UniProtKB/TrEMBL annotation:
The chain holds residues 109 to 216 of 323 of the full protein. It comes from Nostoc sp. 'Peltigera membranacea cyanobiont' 210A. This is CRISPR-associated protein.
RNA sequence: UUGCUCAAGAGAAGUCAUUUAAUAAGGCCACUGUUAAACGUAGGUGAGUCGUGGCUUUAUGCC
């Protein structure tokens, strides 16, 4: 909280910490063409909150990351991050569909 | 250390249930492959099984 109401980085315990890891956003390798999916839910009772449309994209995603390994408080923490980068569980999205 | 430092639009959802492209139709009616002749005379070959049996003089040939 104090990091936003002061100019320096200390206020003494540190006020903030720039993350040693920074990753750019992932972009699709292929230009997006308008593709949607129908979503009508089962049942004869056709009220609202049914017949929805979901946009999807059938391409590959690429992203760029960079870490200052020296900036890490514990130098050994870079290895678990690499393991996570290769074994990335799921990037937030409609994993159900 | 950058109007910065931190920052998931996220969790869930069947486009479903039903429908014969069906009923009818001749590619049909006509056509001669007609008419005539001297063979004068000189062109060749690719493929197994093994020790007496009925006649006949061993003979040597027949089945």
């Amino acid at each position: 909280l104090e990091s936003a109401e002061t100019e320096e980085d200390t206020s003494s315990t540190p006020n903030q910490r720039m993350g040693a890891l920074g990753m750019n956003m992932a972009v699709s390798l292929t230009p997006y063409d308008g593709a949607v999916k129908l979503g009508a839910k089962s049942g004869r009772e056709k009220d609202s909150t049914s017949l929805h449309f979901t946009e999807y994209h059938a391409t590959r995603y690429q992203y760029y990351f960079g870490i200052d390994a020296t900036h890490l408080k514990d130098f050994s923490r870079i290895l678990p991050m690499i393991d996570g980068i290769m074994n990335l569980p799921k990037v937030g999205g409609s994993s159900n569909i």
